[PDB]
């Protein structure tokens, strides 16, 4: 698990 | 359904008549939900992304209703900014990326 | 093409004559590649993930070929665990999520 989520 | 990527792919899921908004996340191997009380045995796990790792609790064989589709698998619970539906549940609802 | 999610959705991309393995990430707003140099001026930005808030270098208007589909947009470079194609480039190559 790497739930690579990203905002910005 | 066909979900476009102009906006974050947010859909409504249901876990034990608790209805939340979660991101359809092809970049996540696992599904991670912000704090909720799930029943059953839960084991500590570490998961990373951009920025580092968070400690979460892993709950097995947890029913998740994603847009009319009955999902059942591993659900991780921890301090995630947004609720995430990962590849483990995504594969079960018959989800693909098409271009 | 149609890409299933039993395995991570890694594809070959071409950026600046170089070929790389990148992950099609519908849970990422932006495209982030692992450390590399690229043509430009760049503005430093901060972005956040499951772990938190990293520093990246932002390149604007960069051509990237994804599975031969042509895109041109923003590309951030930083300490990402894996090369990630986010929604800004996924929309340009007409990528959707279906089930």
Swiss-Prot record, chain A:
Site (Cleavage): 4-5
Superkingdom per UniProt: Viruses
PTM comment text: Gag-Pol polyprotein: Specific enzymatic cleavages by the viral protease yield mature proteins.
Miscellaneous section: HIV-1 lineages are divided in three main groups, M (for Major), O (for Outlier), and N (for New, or Non-M, Non-O). The vast majority of strains found worldwide belong to the group M. Group O seems to be endemic to and largely confined to Cameroon and neighboring countries in West Central Africa, where these viruses represent a small minority of HIV-1 strains. The group N is represented by a limited number of isolates from Cameroonian persons. The group M is further subdivided in 9 clades or subtypes (A to D, F to H, J and K).
The record's note on its domains: Late-budding domains (L domains) are short sequence motifs essential for viral particle budding. They recruit proteins of the host ESCRT machinery (Endosomal Sorting Complex Required for Transport) or ESCRT-associated proteins. p6-gag contains two L domains: a PTAP/PSAP motif, which interacts with the UEV domain of TSG101 and a LYPX(n)L motif which interacts with PDCD6IP/AIP1.
Family: Belongs to the primate lentivirus group gag polyprotein family.
Name the record gives this protein: Gag polyprotein
From Swiss-Prot, chains B, C:
Dimerization of protease: region residues: 1-5, 49-55, 88-99
Catalytic residues, chain numbering: 25
Location of the Peptidase A2 domain: 20-89
Subunit structure: Homodimer, whose active site consists of two apposed aspartic acid residues.
Summary of the function given for this chain in its UniProt record: Aspartyl protease that mediates proteolytic cleavages of Gag and Gag-Pol polyproteins during or shortly after the release of the virion from the plasma membrane. Cleavages take place as an ordered, step-wise cascade to yield mature proteins. This process is called maturation. Displays maximal activity during the budding process just prior to particle release from the cell. Also cleaves Nef and Vif, probably concomitantly with viral structural proteins on maturation of virus particles. Hydrolyzes host EIF4GI and PABP1 in order to shut off the capped cellular mRNA translation.
Protein name: Protease
Full-length numbering of the shown residues: 491 to 589 of 1437
């Amino acid at each position: 698990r790497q739930a690579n989520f990203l905002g910005k | 359904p066909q979900i476009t990527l102009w906006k974050r792919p947010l859909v409504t899921i249901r876990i034990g008549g608790q209805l939340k908004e979660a991101l359809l996340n092809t970049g996540a191997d696992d599904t991670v939900l912000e704090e909720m009380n799930l029943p059953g045995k839960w084991k500590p796990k570490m998961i990373g992304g951009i920025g580092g790792f968070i400690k979460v609790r892993q709950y097995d064989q947890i029913p998740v209703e994603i847009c009319g589709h009955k999902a059942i698998g591993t659900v991780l619970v921890g301090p995630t900014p947004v609720n995430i539906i990962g590849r483990n549940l995504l594969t079960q609802i018959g989800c693909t990326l098409n271009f």
